[PDB]
Amino acid sequence: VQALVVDNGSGNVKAGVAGDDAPRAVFPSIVGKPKNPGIMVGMEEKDCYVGDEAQSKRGILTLKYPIEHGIVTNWDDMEKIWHHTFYNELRVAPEEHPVLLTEAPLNPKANRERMTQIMFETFNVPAMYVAIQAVLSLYSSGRTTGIVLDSGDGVSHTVPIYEGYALPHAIMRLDLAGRDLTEYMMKILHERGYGFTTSAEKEIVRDIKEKLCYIALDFDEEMKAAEDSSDIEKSYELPDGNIITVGNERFRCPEALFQPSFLGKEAAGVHRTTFDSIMKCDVDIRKDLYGNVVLSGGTTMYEGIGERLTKELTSLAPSTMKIKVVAPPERKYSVWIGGSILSSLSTFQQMWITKEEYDESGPSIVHRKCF
Amino acid sequence: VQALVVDNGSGNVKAGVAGDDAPRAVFPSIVGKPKNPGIMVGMEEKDCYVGDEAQSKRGILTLKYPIEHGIVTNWDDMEKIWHHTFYNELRVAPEEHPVLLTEAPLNPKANRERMTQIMFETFNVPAMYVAIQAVLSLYSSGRTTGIVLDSGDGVSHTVPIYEGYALPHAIMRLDLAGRDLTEYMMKILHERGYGFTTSAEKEIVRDIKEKLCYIALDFDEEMKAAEDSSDIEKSYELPDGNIITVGNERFRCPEALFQPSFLGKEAAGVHRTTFDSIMKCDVDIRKDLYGNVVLSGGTTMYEGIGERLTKELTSLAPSTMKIKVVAPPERKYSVWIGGSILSSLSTFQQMWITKEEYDESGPSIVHRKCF
Amino acid sequence: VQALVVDNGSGNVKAGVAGDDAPRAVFPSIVGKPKNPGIMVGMEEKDCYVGDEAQSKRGILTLKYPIEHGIVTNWDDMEKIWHHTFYNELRVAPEEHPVLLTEAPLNPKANRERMTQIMFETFNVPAMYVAIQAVLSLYSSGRTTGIVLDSGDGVSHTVPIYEGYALPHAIMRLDLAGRDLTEYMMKILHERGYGFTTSAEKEIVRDIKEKLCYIALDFDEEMKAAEDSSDIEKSYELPDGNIITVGNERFRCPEALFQPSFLGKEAAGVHRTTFDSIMKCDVDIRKDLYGNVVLSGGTTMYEGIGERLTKELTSLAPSTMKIKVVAPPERKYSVWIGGSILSSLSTFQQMWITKEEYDESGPSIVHRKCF
Ligand SMILES: Nc1ncnc2c1ncn2[C@@H]1O[C@H](COP(=O)(O)OP(=O)(O)O)[C@@H](O)[C@H]1O
Ligand SMILES: Nc1ncnc2c1ncn2[C@@H]1O[C@H](COP(=O)(O)OP(=O)(O)O)[C@@H](O)[C@H]1O
Ligand SMILES: Nc1ncnc2c1ncn2[C@@H]1O[C@H](COP(=O)(O)OP(=O)(O)O)[C@@H](O)[C@H]1O
Ligand SMILES: [Mg+2]
Ligand SMILES: [Mg+2]
Ligand SMILES: [Mg+2]
């Protein structure tokens, strides 16, 4: 019996069966409801739409995300999304497979407890487990030492591991991820006269950001060069045929990853977060940590991110250390692949939280078994 | 059948087979335990690490020494270290070889008794013996007259021998050795803003002390010269790439050997200890004792120690006596070489404490056979 | 002419005139700078804010501490803080009064040298002196024998004194104080879903810690009792009207004083630090040291700290010794009161470092005069 691996990100759901090379169901984690609840007679009317179907007819829907910053904010919508995942995407019976779930570090306890309670009492799974996403990413890379910088839609976090041992006091969390970048792109697109306010327009802006943005090697020099020419400008076509043009916004939008003050946030960038995490470890671990900086998540898919991170870390670290940044081509799915690997191990089969232990101990069992 | 020679120092273990020119296993006498007992699934988790392996991954371990000042303080860890020595380093069966052990003079009796009991009942050796380290050092030098000043990691002691005869009433013991010097270097490195507190940082400080320290010929003049220039300063590179610089600390750290008041200790230096040991012998032995002062141990490996000791002894002794200090290049292994020589002698083969005598008399047999 | 007494702690500044019963100026040791450097036309714009004024409008400022762990890390900000202290708080001319300063033991020498240079060349004082804080605390108590455990915001240290004589080799330093506790409270408040990241939020968290925390007599029993009831929970109101609730965090946050492994630190607690300091003295001093354990600083103001310290020391000490822990009600100002007493003594008036000796010898004079 193979386990099911579900990665509940803030933006997307990655689900599949353990042992597969890639997830087989990747759909947006959205729920949409019709603005005008009324349909032509004879047509089937649905109260809400989930996933790709919600994304397809977003023009007449209001879209909601049940997860913000890695924390579930609407449990009914989360339950609907999980039901969709199990019954329409994977097309399996969850009562026959154990389920491996994922969560971000330094989350509130009630989130984990509700996850366990809903898995055991609503879907009637035989067993389950909750794992940290960066640890799974390190599993995917086939390494036992390194620091993982994970950035998706909700949060950014860094977890260092040395020779298989965890360093919990060095875990750092930054509340700046892809959704913040999409909002900032929306805000700065008003300078050119383009106005996006609705949910579907938010999705269009996210599309534009994914297709047109990149990270500059030197920000001031690139701004100066953009002010002196026009070859940086690119065009994008809207669903209705209109065309928008973007200049320095292309590298200005992702610059908020390294300069969080662009969003009005008093916080350090991802480079400084990684450096601070490394400096909170023992002196004898830092060389290897510098040698194995690993990127993971969708927000690390910008062009030129590795070069910029290497430059910043070289500036911050001593001149003798060698900084190496690894950017796998499939790093958008590293968490799922690592979860599949972990759930496929013979030694892991004793770590499941079974239904008997749950019936004995309540939802609090997850705290003393997953850590 | 050759015997095994094991020198259980406070800092290091020297082990080998009798008849060899040098010991074949020299590793630190440490046991390390993981701070966070948890490893990635699929990895082999060990409760504790011994020796070079413990030294290699000290960044995630807490290191302990089972011996302080020549006295075993943790018998389980000592047993683990001996098991490592026999089975992973030497790769022999201790039940087939007699074992020669070493101890410092004026130690408590229970230490020797426990050594004998553990050797006979846990490792099932055929025979064993316990010898004094300075006597073995005198064996190594091919001489029958002289006074040996031995200084390693735990204790310093002086043993005079004349024409092969022992002088037990003249043996002196000083509780100041390399570990005290490492602690004092740690304390005085805080003046420059460098902070070392953990066990791995203790090992790094010991490394620095070994590589950068020396003994000044005249302390006050050298301090004055250091206050007037900067050519004494040297640099050291930490495992993480940072660089520290040391000035007069280089000769201030080992000066506590000759001025124990630097450590807050009411005791005489090694020169005064040696002189007092010589003055406790008969008037007819002192000339030869002055003529054959022999150094042994790792703490006697500082640069310029022989010149300083000669100057101090010349100051203390009458002007007609000739003071000669011998500093063999391999004096860090003189105890092991002397033990090998002693255990390889045809006349020594009747001095072994056999298993029959042990079964007859209990662990108290060691007191009436080794002396 | 009365002297000025300034206690430059890591968290707060206590300043006043010698002979007074209490300090007359107690303000936070912070410097704040506006995030958005722009103000309405006609308003007075200040580059930076110091002290209570910085604390009052922290919502638009970024706050910095110029001292960490008793070591000045930003000398321009320290100079600004001293200028504020002299000219806006005390409202005196520093060129007319001698100044008594304080420092933590085992600090780097450059800190003291810079203090002397800035006092003599920037503020043009006639004389000055630097004293150890625990010694001043012992002055305040009217006793000549005892061991002082001082804990403020930067560091914790223990200094034993017997019959007026100092024991420098027994001074111990622990790098765990109130700021570490505030950071740990911030970290563990994420379990309930409360997120504090900014500097002003750090100040709010420190407020919460001061108002709601206490030390448990037995940690395991108290944790068990907290897991079984809800009467331990208390509520706190934020500046914006929102309400947070805390359960076992109240006694979990200060427990890191006795269990430094909660912070990932390989170090002994304050009880073990005090015991180790006592055990490094002569056998004939320990009875009195056990009899006169004295608390000082703001981190010793938790409820139940004396009982817990007494229990731990009773566990560690022989059963015949009497352990007495003194907790003065005004122990948050013992260093300042002791400094005032010391600077008001007729015999102390020859210990000042005058401007003539400084002009003769440079900033190095402080090393051969204050010790
Ligand atoms: N090629 C790309 N370039 C830039 N950003 C991308 C790219 N692909 C995806 N993203 C961004 O990554 C974010 C979410 O990715 P993902 O790691 O799946 O998030 P989560 O794991 O939280 O669901 C989205 O906001 C999206 O805009
Ligand atoms: N070249 C050197 N210079 C100075 N000190 C040294 C040197 N080599 C070793 N030491 C010191 O010698 C001490 C232990 O040496 P050793 O004689 O092996 O001790 P033990 O016999 O007690 O194990 C260590 O504390 C180490 O710092
Ligand atoms: N009543 C209290 N209970 C607990 N902690 C307190 C209390 N009052 C002050 N503190 C803590 O004491 C710390 C600093 O006190 P103080 O001794 O003035 O430090 P410093 O001398 O380093 O300026 C602060 O971090 C504060 O949180
Ligand atoms: Mg993700
Ligand atoms: Mg030795
Ligand atoms: Mg203080």
Phi/psi at B100 (5° precision) = -100, 120
Q: Which residue has the tokens 């790709």?
A: A52
Write out the two tokens for C60. 């638009």
A89 pocket-lining for ligand 1 (C-beta < 6 Å): no
Q: Which ligand is nearest to the CA of B185?
A: 2
- Which atom of ligand 3 lies at the shortest distance from residue C133's CA? 21
**Cβ within 8 Å of C, B 224-263:** 263
Tell me how far apart the terminal alpha carbons of chain B are, to the nearest angstrom.
25
Return all residues near C55 (Cβ < 8 A) that are at least 6 apart: C28, C30, C203
| Local structure of residue B17 (DSSP, 8 states) | E
C-beta atoms surrounding B107 within 10 Å: 17
For chain B, give percent helix, strand, coil, nearest 5. Answer: 40, 20, 40
CATH, domain range B4-29+65-133+335-369: 3.30.420.40
Return all residues near C285 (Cβ < 8 A) that are at least 6 apart: C160, C162, C167
**A140, A283, A340, A346: best to mutate for the B interface, most B CBs within 10 A:** A283
List chains touching B (3+ CB pairs under 8 A).
A, C
Characterize the bridge pairing of strands A293-296 and A325-326. Answer: parallel
Distance between CA C295 and CA C299 in Å, rounded? Answer: 10
Is residue C201 classed exposed, middle or buried when 0-12, 13-18 and 19+ CB atoms within 10 A define those classes?
middle
Residue in A108, A170, A267 closest to C193 by CB = A108
Distance between CA B76 and CA C254 in Å, rounded? Answer: 34
B133 pocket-lining for ligand 2 (C-beta < 6 Å): no
* DSSP SS3 for B347: helix
Q: Which residues pair with B237 in a beta bridge?
A: B243
Write out the two tokens for C53. 């004024």
Distance between CA C7 and CA B344 in Å, rounded? Answer: 70
The CATH class for the domain spanning A4-29+65-132+335-369 reads alpha beta
Distance between CA B70 and CA B108 in Å, rounded? Answer: 10
Candidate of A71, A81, A85, A153 to mutate for ligand 1, largest count of ligand atoms within 8 Å of Cβ: A153
Q: How far lies C39's CA from each of A232, A358, C36, C59, C60, in Å?
A: 36, 59, 9, 15, 11
Q: What's the C302 CA to ligand 3 centre distance in angstroms?
A: 10
Write out the two tokens for B39. 């490893």
The answer to whether C54 touches C93, Cβ cutoff 8 Å, is: no
Q: Please, what's the b/e burial string for B143-165 (b: 16 or more CB within 10 A of its CB; e: otherwise)?
A: eebbbbbbbbbbbbbbbbbbeee
Distance between CA A333 and CA A178 in Å, rounded? Answer: 16
| Interface size between A and B, measured as CB pairs under 8 A | 67
Characterize the bridge pairing of strands C12-17 and C25-28. Answer: antiparallel
Q: What's the C26 CA to ligand 6 centre distance in angstroms?
A: 12
- Which atom of ligand 1 lies at the shortest distance from residue A133's CA? 21
Candidate of A6, A8, A10, A12 to mutate for ligand 1, largest count of ligand atoms within 8 Å of Cβ: A12
Q: Taking CB atoms and an 8 Å cutoff, what residues of chain A touch B242?
A: 318
* DSSP SS3 for B23: coil
| Local structure of residue B81 (DSSP, 8 states) | H
Strands (E), chain B: 4-8, 12-17, 25-28, 31-34, 49-50, 61-64, 67-68, 71-72, 99-103, 127-132, 146-151, 156-162, 165-166, 172-174, 234-237, 243-246, 293-296, 325-326, 353-354
Query: Could you list which residues have their CB under 5 Å from ion ligand 5?
Result: B 9, 152
Q: Scanning every residue of chain C, which has its alpha carbon at the shortest distance from the alpha carbon of B193? A: C108
Write out the two tokens for B132. 């004094």
| Interface size between B and C, measured as CB pairs under 8 A | 26
Cβ distance of C170 and B198 shorter than 8 Å? no
Q: What's the B154 CA to ligand 2 centre distance in angstroms?
A: 10
Distance from CA of C285 to the nearest CA of B (A): 15
Cβ distance of A351 and B38 shorter than 8 Å? no
Is residue C164 classed exposed, middle or buried when 0-12, 13-18 and 19+ CB atoms within 10 A define those classes?
exposed
* Closest among C239, C212, C180, C207 to C302, alpha carbons compared: C212
Q: Taking CB atoms and an 8 Å cutoff, what residues of chain C touch A264?
A: 35
Q: Which pairs with CB-CB distance under 8 Å and at least 24 residues apart come from C259-263?
A: C259/C219, C260/C174, C260/C176, C261/B35, C262/C184, C263/A169, C263/C176, C263/C180, C263/C184
Q: Which ligand is nearest to the CA of C104?
A: 6
Distance between CA A111 and CA A75 in Å, rounded? Answer: 10
Q: Which residues pair with B147 in a beta bridge?
A: B160, B293
A10 pocket-lining for ligand 1 (C-beta < 6 Å): yes
Cβ distance of C266 and B199 shorter than 8 Å? yes
Q: Using CA of residue A33, residue A35, residue A36, residue A41, what is the dihedral sign?
A: negative
Cβ distance of C266 and B193 shorter than 8 Å? no
Q: What's the B5 CA to ligand 1 centre distance in angstroms?
A: 65
Return left, alpha or beta for A273; rule: phi > 0 is left, psi -120 to 50 is alpha, else beta.
alpha
Distance between CA A161 and CA A330 in Å, rounded? Answer: 21
* Closest among A175, A153, A137, A169 to A293, alpha carbons compared: A137
User: Would you tell me the crossing angle of helices A133-140 and A334-343 to the nearest 10 degrees?
Assistant: 80
Tell me how far apart the terminal alpha carbons of chain A are, to the nearest angstrom.
25
**Cβ within 8 Å of B, A 256-285:** 281-285
Distance between CA B29 and CA B40 in Å, rounded? Answer: 28
Q: Using CA of residue B338, residue B340, residue B345, residue B347, what is the dihedral sign?
A: positive
Q: What's the A332 CA to ligand 4 centre distance in angstroms?
A: 8
Q: How far lies A116's CA from each of A32, A105, A127, in Å?
A: 26, 16, 10
The answer to whether B258 touches B308, Cβ cutoff 8 Å, is: yes
Characterize the bridge pairing of strands C67-68 and B325-326. Answer: unpaired
* DSSP SS3 for B330: coil
Is residue B266 classed exposed, middle or buried when 0-12, 13-18 and 19+ CB atoms within 10 A define those classes?
exposed
Nearest-CA residue for atom 25 of ligand 2: B178
Cβ distance of A318 and B240 shorter than 8 Å? yes
Domains C142-175+268-327 and C178-257 alike in fold: no
Distance between CA C54 and CA C33 in Å, rounded? Answer: 8
Tell me the one-letter amino acid at B68.
Answer: E
C-beta atoms surrounding C227 within 10 Å: 11
* Closest among A34, A110, A40, A125 to A72, alpha carbons compared: A110
Cβ distance of A166 and B38 shorter than 8 Å? yes
Q: Which residues pair with B247 in a beta bridge?
A: none
Is domain C142-175+268-327 given the CATH code 3.30.420.40 in the classification?
A: yes
Judge whether B63 is closer than 8 Å to chain A, CB to CB. Answer: no
- Which atom of ligand 3 lies at the shortest distance from residue C13's CA? 23
The answer to whether B141 touches B127, Cβ cutoff 8 Å, is: no
Tell me the one-letter amino acid at A359.
Answer: D
* DSSP SS3 for B281: coil
What is the 3-state secondary structure of chain C?
CCCEEEEECCCEEEEEECCCCCCCEEEECCEEEECCCCCCCCCCCCCCEECHHHHHCHHHEEEECCEECCEECCHHHHHHHHHHHHHHHCCCCCCCCCEEEEECCCCCHHHHHHHHHHHHHCCCCCEEEEEEHHHHHHHHCCCCCEEEEEECCCCEEEEEEECCEECHHHCEEECCCHHHHHHHHHHHHHHHCCCCCCHHHHHHHHHHHHHHCCCCCCHHHHHHHHCCCCCCCEEEECCCCCEEEECCHHHHCHHHHCCHHHHCCCCCCHHHHHHHHHHCCCCCCHHHHHHCEEEECHHHCCCCHHHHHHHHHHHHCCCCCCCCEECCCCHHHHHHHHHHHHHCCCHHHHCCEEHHHHHHHCCCHHHHHCC
The answer to whether B120 touches B358, Cβ cutoff 8 Å, is: yes
Distance between CA B200 and CA B211 in Å, rounded? Answer: 17
Distance between CA C6 and CA C23 in Å, rounded? Answer: 9
* Closest among A313, A276, A315 to A291, alpha carbons compared: A313
- Kindly state which CATH superfamily the domain A178-257 is placed in: ATPase, substrate binding domain, subdomain 4 (3.90.640.10)
Nearest-CA residue for atom 15 of ligand 3: C298
Tell me how far apart the terminal alpha carbons of chain C are, to the nearest angstrom.
25
Q: Which residues pair with A260 in a beta bridge?
A: none
Distance between CA B269 and CA B264 in Å, rounded? Answer: 13
Distance between CA C89 and CA B64 in Å, rounded? Answer: 52
C254 pocket-lining for ligand 3 (C-beta < 6 Å): no
Q: How far lies C181's CA from each of C195, C261, C300, in Å?
A: 16, 13, 12
Q: Scanning every residue of chain C, which has its alpha carbon at the shortest distance from the alpha carbon of B194? A: C108
A11 pocket-lining for ligand 1 (C-beta < 6 Å): yes
The answer to whether A90 touches A6, Cβ cutoff 8 Å, is: no
Distance between CA C85 and CA C91 in Å, rounded? Answer: 8
Q: Which ligand is nearest to the CA of B67?
A: 2
Write out the two tokens for A84. 């969709």
* Closest among B14, B11, B20 to B333, alpha carbons compared: B14
Q: How far lies C299's CA from each of B297, C28, C65, C218, in Å?
A: 47, 15, 18, 19
User: Would you tell me the crossing angle of helices A75-84 and A109-121 to the nearest 10 degrees?
Assistant: 50
Cβ distance of A135 and B36 shorter than 8 Å? no
C-beta atoms surrounding B265 within 10 Å: 15
Q: Please, what's the b/e burial string for C31-67 (b: 16 or more CB within 10 A of its CB; e: otherwise)?
A: bbbbeeeeeeeeeeeeeebbbebbbeebeebebebbb
Tell me the one-letter amino acid at A261.
Answer: S
Residue in B42, B43, B240 closest to A283 by CB = B240
Return all residues near C330 (Cβ < 8 A) that are at least 6 apart: C22, C337
Q: How far lies B162's CA from each of A298, B285, C307, in Å?
A: 81, 7, 62
Tell me the one-letter amino acid at C281.
Answer: C
Cβ distance of A139 and B40 shorter than 8 Å? yes
| Local structure of residue B39 (DSSP, 8 states) | B
Candidate of C156, C299, C332, C334 to mutate for ligand 3, largest count of ligand atoms within 8 Å of Cβ: C299
Write out the two tokens for C222. 């108290």
Domain range summary for chain A, segments of one domain joined by + = 4-29+65-132+335-369, 142-175+268-327, 178-257
* DSSP SS3 for B354: strand
B102 pocket-lining for ligand 2 (C-beta < 6 Å): no
This entry's atomic model was obtained through cryo-EM
Return all residues near A91 (Cβ < 8 A) that are at least 6 apart: none
Write out the two tokens for B76. 């389980």
* Closest among B276, B339, B278 to B103, alpha carbons compared: B339
The answer to whether C295 touches C303, Cβ cutoff 8 Å, is: no
Distance between CA B257 and CA A96 in Å, rounded? Answer: 73
Candidate of C72, C153, C174, C213 to mutate for ligand 3, largest count of ligand atoms within 8 Å of Cβ: C153
Distance between CA B344 and CA C208 in Å, rounded? Answer: 73
Write out the two tokens for C110. 């450059």
The answer to whether A137 touches A341, Cβ cutoff 8 Å, is: no
- Measured in angstroms, the resolution is 2.5
Is residue C143 classed exposed, middle or buried when 0-12, 13-18 and 19+ CB atoms within 10 A define those classes?
middle
Q: Taking CB atoms and an 8 Å cutoff, what residues of chain B touch A138?
A: 40
Distance between CA C243 and CA C253 in Å, rounded? Answer: 19
The answer to whether A6 touches A13, Cβ cutoff 8 Å, is: yes
